[PDB]
Design an enzyme around this catalytic site. Sequence first.
Site, PDB file in Angstrom:
ATOM      1  N   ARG A 147       0.802  -1.217   0.000  1.00  0.00           N
ATOM      2  CA  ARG A 147       0.000   0.000   0.000  1.00  0.00           C
ATOM      3  C   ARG A 147       0.838   1.271   0.000  1.00  0.00           C
ATOM      4  O   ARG A 147       1.988   1.276   0.443  1.00  0.00           O
ATOM      5  CB  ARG A 147      -1.039  -0.003   1.135  1.00  0.00           C
ATOM      6  CG  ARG A 147      -0.510   0.013   2.566  1.00  0.00           C
ATOM      7  CD  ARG A 147      -0.099   1.410   3.039  1.00  0.00           C
ATOM      8  NE  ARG A 147       0.065   1.458   4.490  1.00  0.00           N
ATOM      9  CZ  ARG A 147       0.774   2.366   5.157  1.00  0.00           C
ATOM     10  NH1 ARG A 147       1.470   3.289   4.513  1.00  0.00           N
ATOM     11  NH2 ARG A 147       0.817   2.321   6.486  1.00  0.00           N
ATOM     12  N   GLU A 194      -7.472   6.847   7.669  1.00  0.00           N
ATOM     13  CA  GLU A 194      -6.368   7.550   8.321  1.00  0.00           C
ATOM     14  C   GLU A 194      -5.775   8.617   7.395  1.00  0.00           C
ATOM     15  O   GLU A 194      -5.452   9.720   7.835  1.00  0.00           O
ATOM     16  CB  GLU A 194      -5.279   6.560   8.758  1.00  0.00           C
ATOM     17  CG  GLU A 194      -4.033   7.225   9.327  1.00  0.00           C
ATOM     18  CD  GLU A 194      -3.025   6.231   9.882  1.00  0.00           C
ATOM     19  OE1 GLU A 194      -1.822   6.557   9.891  1.00  0.00           O
ATOM     20  OE2 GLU A 194      -3.431   5.136  10.321  1.00  0.00           O
ATOM     21  N   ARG A 226      -5.673   5.665   0.636  1.00  0.00           N
ATOM     22  CA  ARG A 226      -4.703   4.584   0.688  1.00  0.00           C
ATOM     23  C   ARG A 226      -4.933   3.761  -0.562  1.00  0.00           C
ATOM     24  O   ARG A 226      -6.056   3.346  -0.846  1.00  0.00           O
ATOM     25  CB  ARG A 226      -4.891   3.707   1.932  1.00  0.00           C
ATOM     26  CG  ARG A 226      -4.577   4.401   3.263  1.00  0.00           C
ATOM     27  CD  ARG A 226      -3.079   4.662   3.418  1.00  0.00           C
ATOM     28  NE  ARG A 226      -2.711   5.167   4.743  1.00  0.00           N
ATOM     29  CZ  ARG A 226      -2.664   4.430   5.850  1.00  0.00           C
ATOM     30  NH1 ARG A 226      -2.930   3.132   5.805  1.00  0.00           N
ATOM     31  NH2 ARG A 226      -2.334   4.991   7.009  1.00  0.00           N
ATOM     32  N   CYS A 267       0.148  10.342   9.776  1.00  0.00           N
ATOM     33  CA  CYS A 267       1.103   9.817  10.758  1.00  0.00           C
ATOM     34  C   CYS A 267       2.532   9.978  10.237  1.00  0.00           C
ATOM     35  O   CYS A 267       2.797   9.763   9.053  1.00  0.00           O
ATOM     36  CB  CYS A 267       0.817   8.344  11.074  1.00  0.00           C
ATOM     37  SG  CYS A 267       1.958   7.566  12.269  1.00  0.00           S
ATOM     38  N   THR A 302       4.980   8.063  10.670  1.00  0.00           N
ATOM     39  CA  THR A 302       5.526   6.781  10.239  1.00  0.00           C
ATOM     40  C   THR A 302       5.298   6.528   8.747  1.00  0.00           C
ATOM     41  O   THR A 302       5.940   5.664   8.149  1.00  0.00           O
ATOM     42  CB  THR A 302       4.865   5.617  10.990  1.00  0.00           C
ATOM     43  OG1 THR A 302       3.467   5.585  10.679  1.00  0.00           O
ATOM     44  CG2 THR A 302       5.056   5.765  12.495  1.00  0.00           C
ATOM     45  N   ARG A 361       3.977   0.502   2.601  1.00  0.00           N
ATOM     46  CA  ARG A 361       4.057  -0.644   3.493  1.00  0.00           C
ATOM     47  C   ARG A 361       3.769  -1.908   2.702  1.00  0.00           C
ATOM     48  O   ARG A 361       2.630  -2.162   2.296  1.00  0.00           O
ATOM     49  CB  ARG A 361       3.098  -0.515   4.684  1.00  0.00           C
ATOM     50  CG  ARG A 361       3.372  -1.529   5.805  1.00  0.00           C
ATOM     51  CD  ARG A 361       2.563  -1.245   7.076  1.00  0.00           C
ATOM     52  NE  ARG A 361       1.245  -1.877   7.083  1.00  0.00           N
ATOM     53  CZ  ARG A 361       1.036  -3.156   7.384  1.00  0.00           C
ATOM     54  NH1 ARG A 361       2.063  -3.939   7.687  1.00  0.00           N
ATOM     55  NH2 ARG A 361      -0.197  -3.647   7.411  1.00  0.00           N
ATOM     56  N   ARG A 410       2.995  -7.409  12.933  1.00  0.00           N
ATOM     57  CA  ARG A 410       1.643  -7.050  13.352  1.00  0.00           C
ATOM     58  C   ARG A 410       0.764  -8.293  13.399  1.00  0.00           C
ATOM     59  O   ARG A 410       1.105  -9.321  12.811  1.00  0.00           O
ATOM     60  CB  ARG A 410       1.048  -6.050  12.361  1.00  0.00           C
ATOM     61  CG  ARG A 410       1.764  -4.718  12.333  1.00  0.00           C
ATOM     62  CD  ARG A 410       1.212  -3.823  11.245  1.00  0.00           C
ATOM     63  NE  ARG A 410       1.919  -2.551  11.204  1.00  0.00           N
ATOM     64  CZ  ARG A 410       1.393  -1.408  10.782  1.00  0.00           C
ATOM     65  NH1 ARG A 410       0.150  -1.374  10.323  1.00  0.00           N
ATOM     66  NH2 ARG A 410       2.125  -0.304  10.795  1.00  0.00           N
ATOM     67  N   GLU A 443      -2.250  -3.824  12.913  1.00  0.00           N
ATOM     68  CA  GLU A 443      -1.517  -3.377  14.093  1.00  0.00           C
ATOM     69  C   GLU A 443      -2.374  -3.454  15.355  1.00  0.00           C
ATOM     70  O   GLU A 443      -3.593  -3.299  15.283  1.00  0.00           O
ATOM     71  CB  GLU A 443      -0.994  -1.959  13.866  1.00  0.00           C
ATOM     72  CG  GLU A 443      -2.073  -0.956  13.493  1.00  0.00           C
ATOM     73  CD  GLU A 443      -1.570   0.472  13.521  1.00  0.00           C
ATOM     74  OE1 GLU A 443      -0.358   0.669  13.738  1.00  0.00           O
ATOM     75  OE2 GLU A 443      -2.378   1.394  13.283  1.00  0.00           O
TER      76      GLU A 443
HETATM   77  N1  LIG Z   1      -0.231  -9.220   3.481  1.00  0.00           N
HETATM   78  C1  LIG Z   1      -1.566  -9.026   3.761  1.00  0.00           C
HETATM   79  N2  LIG Z   1      -2.480  -9.892   3.207  1.00  0.00           N
HETATM   80  C2  LIG Z   1      -3.791  -9.654   3.520  1.00  0.00           C
HETATM   81  N3  LIG Z   1      -4.336  -8.695   4.292  1.00  0.00           N
HETATM   82  C3  LIG Z   1      -3.389  -7.849   4.835  1.00  0.00           C
HETATM   83  C4  LIG Z   1      -1.988  -7.969   4.599  1.00  0.00           C
HETATM   84  N4  LIG Z   1      -1.279  -6.967   5.283  1.00  0.00           N
HETATM   85  C5  LIG Z   1      -2.235  -6.257   5.912  1.00  0.00           C
HETATM   86  N5  LIG Z   1      -3.535  -6.758   5.665  1.00  0.00           N
HETATM   87  C6  LIG Z   1      -4.791  -6.178   6.227  1.00  0.00           C
HETATM   88  O1  LIG Z   1      -4.844  -4.827   5.993  1.00  0.00           O
HETATM   89  C7  LIG Z   1      -5.771  -4.205   6.900  1.00  0.00           C
HETATM   90  C8  LIG Z   1      -5.109  -2.898   7.523  1.00  0.00           C
HETATM   91  O2  LIG Z   1      -4.326  -3.196   8.561  1.00  0.00           O
HETATM   92  P1  LIG Z   1      -3.083  -2.022   9.201  1.00  0.00           P
HETATM   93  O3  LIG Z   1      -2.457  -3.024  10.136  1.00  0.00           O
HETATM   94  O4  LIG Z   1      -4.099  -1.032   9.675  1.00  0.00           O
HETATM   95  O5  LIG Z   1      -2.352  -1.741   7.877  1.00  0.00           O
HETATM   96  P2  LIG Z   1      -2.287  -0.252   6.921  1.00  0.00           P
HETATM   97  O6  LIG Z   1      -3.040   0.834   7.659  1.00  0.00           O
HETATM   98  O7  LIG Z   1      -0.833   0.108   6.703  1.00  0.00           O
HETATM   99  O8  LIG Z   1      -3.025  -0.936   5.792  1.00  0.00           O
HETATM  100  C9  LIG Z   1      -6.071  -5.289   7.965  1.00  0.00           C
HETATM  101  O9  LIG Z   1      -7.272  -5.940   7.715  1.00  0.00           O
HETATM  102  C10 LIG Z   1      -4.957  -6.351   7.736  1.00  0.00           C
HETATM  103  O10 LIG Z   1      -5.438  -7.648   7.903  1.00  0.00           O
HETATM  104  N1  LIG Z   2       0.327   4.110  12.164  1.00  0.00           N
HETATM  105  C1  LIG Z   2       0.884   3.410  13.332  1.00  0.00           C
HETATM  106  C2  LIG Z   2       0.766   4.290  14.596  1.00  0.00           C
HETATM  107  C3  LIG Z   2      -0.466   3.852  15.388  1.00  0.00           C
HETATM  108  C4  LIG Z   2      -0.565   4.520  16.778  1.00  0.00           C
HETATM  109  N2  LIG Z   2      -0.557   5.973  16.608  1.00  0.00           N
HETATM  110  C5  LIG Z   2       0.691   4.089  17.627  1.00  0.00           C
HETATM  111  O1  LIG Z   2       1.495   4.984  17.923  1.00  0.00           O
HETATM  112  O2  LIG Z   2       0.783   2.878  17.927  1.00  0.00           O
HETATM  113 MG   LIG Z   3      -4.391   1.223   9.168  1.00  0.00          MG
END
Ligand SMILES: Nc1ncnc2c1ncn2[C@@H]1O[C@H](COP(=O)(O)OP(=O)(O)O)[C@@H](O)[C@H]1O
Ligand SMILES: NCCC[C@H](N)C(=O)O
Ligand SMILES: [Mg+2]
Length: 356
Positions: free
Chosen positions: A125, A224, A228, A270, A272, A279, A308, A313
């Site tokens: 993403r 967020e 995305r 964020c 990060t 990511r 995670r 997370e």
């Molecule tokens: N490799 C993956 N395969 C399938 N689903 C994923 C994978 N990596 C993350 N997800 C999903 O993406 C969604 C967002 O999770 P987060 O941990 O908030 O990641 P971000 O905000 O960077 O997408 C969650 O449902 C998680 O299960």
């Molecule tokens: N995007 C990851 C950061 C999530 C939360 N603000 C933390 O500090 O754990």
């Molecule tokens: Mg997220």
Amino acid sequence: VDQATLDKLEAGFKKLQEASDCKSLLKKHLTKDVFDSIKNKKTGMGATLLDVIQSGVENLDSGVGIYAPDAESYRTFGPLFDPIIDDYHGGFKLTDKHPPKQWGDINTLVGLDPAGQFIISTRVRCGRSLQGYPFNPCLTAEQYKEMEEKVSSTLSSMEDELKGTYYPLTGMSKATQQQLIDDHFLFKEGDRFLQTANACRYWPTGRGIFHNDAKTFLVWVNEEDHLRIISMQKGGDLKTVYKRLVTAVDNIESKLPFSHDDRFGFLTFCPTNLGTTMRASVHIQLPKLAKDRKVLEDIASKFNLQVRGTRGEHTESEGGVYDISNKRRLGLTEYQAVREMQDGILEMIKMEKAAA
Ligand SMILES: Nc1ncnc2c1ncn2[C@@H]1O[C@H](COP(=O)(O)OP(=O)(O)O)[C@@H](O)[C@H]1O
Ligand SMILES: NCCC[C@H](N)C(=O)O
Ligand SMILES: [Mg+2]
């Protein structure tokens, strides 16, 4: 800055100092000098230090604990952001600048797990912010709606593999929403870290998800970040997953103006997520190495990877399935970021095979 907010700030600093078992970067880097040096400052939109740190004060289990209410906040409150950013991204000095966008040579990426016994699925993403709009805490309800219109209309012009449909959360059935979240496609509703940052106001107004019918290409609207942009599928074909993301981002970038900073690269809510905003992750099973998620995490960190839970997370692993991804996003190119995940995951798999 009003006295009432100072009261809340003064109390928060004390709580963080007192929080003996808090391990977040906010606590580590918010010194009295830092605290006193910036607590009376305010942006053009009126964002204060409380808006920045409140999520980390209330949620002591935060890993980071801060967000930028607007772009200016990153500098107005530099003395807090700068050391935290330097720390999180594995080295990024005050005088450093994020490198130019560079996807790299996609044909050099390989299949991450050919025998198919470890990796379940692969995902990459990025995030983007629309020019002229501040981050979540500074948006009005009307602005959420305006952005939704702009993004949804733009994505109606996607073609071929990327052609798809926009689904607003408003009017979306509860049953449909829960399945999309459970299947790892749609962002969750009700996150305490985002909530306390006032990032979820007016929910679900303006929020939704675009995806192609196969759900290998998705775009989150107004979670967020403003956008995305997501590519994902079963298996370990990172090359294909990554190529689809590149194609999508290049096409969308030509149509919508996104915020980019000479120092911080692409801007996000964020710290990060700055820079490449990328990511790249796998859902993977590693039963021998994961015999203690604390051991798994120690191994991953040396490869600059983050661990995670299965639902994202701040969640636990279910059925031995972990989310493992590159941790760093700023001060390295897109190519470098995605290669750290590839390189780390290939070696962890080697270690798993060699393990007793
Ligand atoms: N490799 C993956 N395969 C399938 N689903 C994923 C994978 N990596 C993350 N997800 C999903 O993406 C969604 C967002 O999770 P987060 O941990 O908030 O990641 P971000 O905000 O960077 O997408 C969650 O449902 C998680 O299960
Ligand atoms: N995007 C990851 C950061 C999530 C939360 N603000 C933390 O500090 O754990
Ligand atoms: Mg997220």
